[PDB]
Amino acid sequence: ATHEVHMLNKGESGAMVFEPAFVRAEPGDVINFVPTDKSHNVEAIKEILPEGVESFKSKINESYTLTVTEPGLYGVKCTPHFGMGMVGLVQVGDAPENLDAAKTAKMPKKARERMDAELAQVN
Amino acid sequence: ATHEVHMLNKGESGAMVFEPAFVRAEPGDVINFVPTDKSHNVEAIKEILPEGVESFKSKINESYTLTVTEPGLYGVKCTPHFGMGMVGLVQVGDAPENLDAAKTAKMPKKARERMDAELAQVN
Amino acid sequence: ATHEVHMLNKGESGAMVFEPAFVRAEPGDVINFVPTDKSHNVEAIKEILPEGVESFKSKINESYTLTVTEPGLYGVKCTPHFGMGMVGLVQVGDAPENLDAAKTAKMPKKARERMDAELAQVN
Amino acid sequence: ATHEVHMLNKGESGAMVFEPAFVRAEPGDVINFVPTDKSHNVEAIKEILPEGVESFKSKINESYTLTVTEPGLYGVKCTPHFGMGMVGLVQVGDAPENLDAAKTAKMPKKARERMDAELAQVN
Ligand SMILES: [Cu+2]
Ligand SMILES: [Cu+2]
Ligand SMILES: [Cu+2]
Ligand SMILES: [Cu+2]
């Protein structure tokens, strides 16, 4: 299954957001990160990735296709807007092993707020 | 401004969801609830409404337009899927007075989980 | 099956548009007409409706749910923006009987341009 | 500005489509082609490109970002689905010089049908 995430200046939840900010996916699914508005990218949050998953960082304004082969949590940020709290979370499969890492990862205050909100969606 | 909320069997955050589940709006805005999938409606959570706002309850399978004139939090549920956690939250203006009412409102376990996730977005 | 059509100020195809401007649907499907931007509505083009289908006209800024029970072509306009060419076309089933009516219906020049474009999608 | 085009097995206009199939853009804009469904790519129709623009051909299942620097018409096809009519058209600037080239370019019957529909949108 394929899921789409937009990078927005002003979304339903607030400013400088990934929308949806949380995706529950299954191993092997595809996540498409697509700008709606210019100025944004998608970059892995190093500390919030499953074992073995390589970091990624897209170029500003390009669509990025992520295949989530590995189960766990994948945290993403928008590089220029990380401090503005522009972060997203993809849960791949049940009972992610790296939940504690996602809860304790250091990031800017507003990013940590939005990440805690996303974590509240884990199921 | 208009805002759109989809009523879904299976959304990015899980089964039986409003998507987006949280909307930040301004006084006077309209929230359109869209029957993307059949079987859903929108109904006020009477314990999560600003002062002076009337309850509402749409018919299954219809569009519903909520005009949010008064500031504060508006909780919504889908009537047949309340116990499956199909609840949403609209924040109108800054510093909603009824935050605590929304934190404590009685509801089915899964609805309370989702509602806590929505609350985590208030800003 | 359900299909969604947005009412936009500026879409990929131009200004004051329904997007998608053409939907191929099957009898019994649902069309959701949803504003993305304020100022728009959906109204039937009288002369482009199947036999027996009643006209409709939504209120500005509200989502409108149309069940396309009857086969044929359903032409729609946005009332205030008809002259700006804000029109859409829904083909319900094969070989619509009212094709000639859709080709010859009088409307403002820009509406006729966009309707001819939509007609070029009939299949 | 960014623009998004989805690559779909089944879209609103029929099977094997770019959606939107026609994009109006400005010099410098980017067009993101998004693999919403697998099995697709984007490839230039070399007979429908402005002067001085290089051909391109993406890999199946990947995002592709086309930067449209030069004014005129850019025709695109999905390589495995060209005969199934999976073609798109991007208009960059006013009064494209290569309109006639796009009207007459040789292609499979269904691709020519879709391409004529896209052309009907040029303005
Ligand atoms: Cu950003
Ligand atoms: Cu429901
Ligand atoms: Cu309009
Ligand atoms: Cu294809």
Secondary structure of D41-110 as H, E, C letters: CCEECCCCCCCCCCCCECCCCCCEEEECCCCEEEEEECHHHCCCCCEEEEEECCCCCCHHHHHHCCCCHH
CB atoms within 10 A of CB A26: 12
B43 touches B77 (CB < 8 A): yes
Instruction: Report how far residue C102's alpha carbon sits from residue C104's, in angstroms, rounded to the nearest whole number.
Output: 6
| CA quadruple C83, C85, D3, A87: dihedral sign | positive
User: Which of D2, D4, D6, D69 best tests the A interface by mutation, with the highest count of A CBs <10 A?
Assistant: D2
Whole-number Å distance between alpha carbons of B35 and B19: 11
Tell me whether residue C46 is exposed, middle or buried, using C-beta atoms within 10 angstroms of its C-beta: 0 to 12, 13 to 18, 19 or more: exposed
The three-state secondary structure class of D25 is: strand
Chains B and D touch (3+ CB pairs under 8 A): no
* Cα–Cα distance, B36 to B26 (Å, whole number): 25
For residue A109, what are its two tokens?
């205050």
Three-state DSSP state, D33: strand
Chain A interface includes B123 (CB < 8 A)? yes
For residue A6, the ligand closest to its alpha carbon is 1
CB contact under 8 A, C12 and D19: no
The two structure tokens encoding residue A101: 């890492």
Instruction: Give the Cα separation of A21 and A74 in Å (integer).
Output: 12
Q: How far is CA D13 from CA A84, A120, C90, D21, in A?
A: 39, 39, 10, 9
Q: With beta carbons under 8 A apart, name residues in chain C contacting D19.
A: 20
Find the helix or strand (DSSP H, E) in which B113 lies.
Answer: helix B109-119
Biggest alpha carbon–alpha carbon distance for chain A: 35
Angstroms from C38 CA to nearest CA on chain B: 6
- Rounded to the nearest 10°, the torsion over CA A81, A2, B122, B18 is 160
SS3 of A6, please?
strand
Round to whole Å and give the CA distance between A51 and A65: 19
The one-letter amino acid at C39? S
CB crowding D76-103: b at 16 or more within 10 Å, else e:
bbbeebbebbbbbbbbbbeebebeebbe
CA–CA separation, A123 and A96 (whole Å)? 9
β-pair type (C29-35, D14-19): unpaired
A residues 7..26 contacting B (CB < 8 A): 11-14, 19-20, 22-24
Q: Which residues are CB-contacts of A108 (< 8 A; sequence separation ≥ 6)?
A: A82, A83, A85
The answer to whether the beta carbons of residues A63 and D32 sit under 8 Å apart is yes
Q: Would you say C66 and C31 are in contact if contact means Cβ atoms under 8 Å apart?
A: yes
Asked if C74 has any chain B CB less than 8 Å from its own CB, the reply is no
Q: Do chains C and D touch (3 or more CB pairs under 8 A)?
A: yes
Name the one residue in this structure whose structure tokens are 């759109």.
B4
Report residue A52 CA to chain centroid gap. Answer: 17
How many C-beta neighbours within 10 Å does residue D27 have?
Answer: 11
Residue with tokens 């691709």: D111
**Residue A116 DSSP symbol:** H
In a mutational test of the C interface, the residue from D2, D3, D5, D13 whose CB has the highest number of chain C CBs within 10 Å is: D13
φ, ψ at C114 (rounded to 5°): -70, -35
| Domain enclosing residue B116, as ranges | 1-123
Tokens of B13: 């955050």
Residue D43, Cβ neighbours under 10 Å: how many?
18
Write out the two tokens for C5: 């059509």
Cβ contact D105:D47 at 8 Å: yes
Q: A36 CB near a chain B CB, below 8 Å? A: no
Residue C81, marked binder = yes
Asked if the Cβ–Cβ distance from D121 to C117 is below 8 Å, we say yes
Does the annotation list D40 as a binding residue? yes
Structure tokens at A29: 């699914």
Residue B23: half-sphere exposure toward Cβ, Cα within 13 Å: 28
Q: How many CB atoms lie within 10 A of CB A10?
A: 12
Residues A37 and A9: beta-carbon distance below 8 Å: yes
Task: Give the separation between CA C79 and CA A45, rounded to whole angstroms.
Answer: 48
State how far the Cα of B75 lies from the Cα of B2, in Å rounded to an integer.
18
Half-sphere exposure of D25 (CA within 13 A, CB side): 28
**Resolution in angstrom units:** 1.8
Q: How many CB atoms lie within 10 A of CB B100?
A: 10
Using CB atoms, which residue from D3, D13, D113 is nearest to C20? D13
Contact B120 A120 (CB under 8 A): yes
Chain D CB contacts of C20 below 8 Å: 12-13, 19-20
Q: Which residues of B12-42 are buried (b: 16+ CB within 10 A; e: fewer)?
A: bbbebbbbbbbbbbeeebbbbbbbbbeebbb
Q: Which chains touch D (3 or more CB pairs under 8 A)?
A: A, C
Burial class (CB in 10 A: 0-12, 13-18, 19+), C104: exposed
Residue type, C32: N
Residue D54: how many other CB atoms lie within 10 Å: 7
Is C6 part of any known ligand binding site?
no
Q: Is B45 exposed, middle or buried (0-12, 13-18, 19+ CB in 10 A)?
A: buried
**3-state secondary structure (DSSP) of residue B12:** coil
List residues bridging with C5 in a β-sheet: C33
Half-sphere exposure at residue C54, Cβ-oriented, CA atoms within 13 angstroms: 4
Neighbours of C63 (CB within 10 A): 25
Q: Which residues contact A94 (CB under 8 A, 6 or more apart)?
A: A71
CA-based nearest distance D14→chain C, Å: 7
Residues of C in contact with B33 (CB under 8 A): 63
Are D3 and D64 a contacting pair, CB within 8 Å?
no
C-alpha span between D88 and D118 (Å, rounded) = 7
Residues C99/C116, Cβ–Cβ less than 8 Å: no
CATH of the domain at B75: 2.60.40.420
What CA–CA distance (Å, rounded) separates D88 from D77? 6
Angle value at C-alpha A87, between A82 and A90, nearest 5 degrees: 150
Tokens of B58: 């749409």
Using alpha carbons only, how large is chain C's radius of gyration in Å? Answer: 13
Q: Which residue has the tokens 């929108």?
A: B42
Asked whether at least 3 C-beta pairs link C and B within 8 Å, the reply is: yes
DSSP state of A95: S
Q: Chain C partners of B34 at a C-beta cutoff of 8 Å?
A: 4, 32, 34, 63, 65
Q: Across chain B, which distance is largest between two alpha carbons, in Å? A: 35
Distance D8 CA to ligand 4 centre (A): 7
Looking at residue B4, what DSSP letter applies? E
Listed residue (B81, B80, B79, B122) closest to B100, CA to CA: B122
- The rounded Å distance from CA A76 to ligand 2 centre is 30
Q: Which two tokens stand for residue C102?
A: 């859709």
Cα dihedral D107→D111→D117→D121 (10° resolution): -70
Q: Are A72 and A48 in contact (CB under 8 A)?
A: no
Q: Which residue has the tokens 């099957």?
A: C26
Q: For residues B16 and B9, is the Cβ–Cβ distance under 8 A?
A: yes
Asked if D35 lies within 8 A of A30 by C-beta distance, the reply is: yes
Q: CA B67: distance to chain centroid?
A: 13
**Tokens linked to C25:** 């649907």
CA–CA gap between residue C64 and residue C72 (Å, rounded): 19
Whether residue C14 contacts residue C20, with contact meaning beta carbons closer than 8 Å, is answered with no
* First-to-last C-alpha distance (Å) of chain B: 19
Is omega for the bond preceding C20 within 30 degrees of 0, making it cis? yes
CA-to-CA dists, residue A47 to A42, A79, A102, C8, C28, angstroms: 15, 15, 7, 40, 49
Phi, psi (rounded to 5 degrees) for C109: -55, -45
Which two three-digit tokens encode residue A112?
């940590």
User: How far apart (Å, rounded) are the C-alpha atoms in residues B57 and B14?
Assistant: 23
* DSSP code, position B95: S
Chain D positions in Cβ-Cβ contact with residue A42 (cut-off 8 Å) = none
CA dihedral C36, C40, C43, C49 (to 10 degrees): -50
Closest alpha carbon to C123 in C101, C93, C103: C93
| Structural domain count, chain D | 1
Phi and psi at residue B61, to the nearest 5°: 75, 0
Query: How far does B103 lie from chain C, in Å, by closest CA?
Result: 30
Helix (H) or strand (E) holding B1: none
Chain A residue at shortest CA distance from D66: A62
Q: Which residues of B touch A10 (CB under 8 A)?
A: none
Question: Could you give the 3-state DSSP secondary structure of residue D29?
Answer: coil
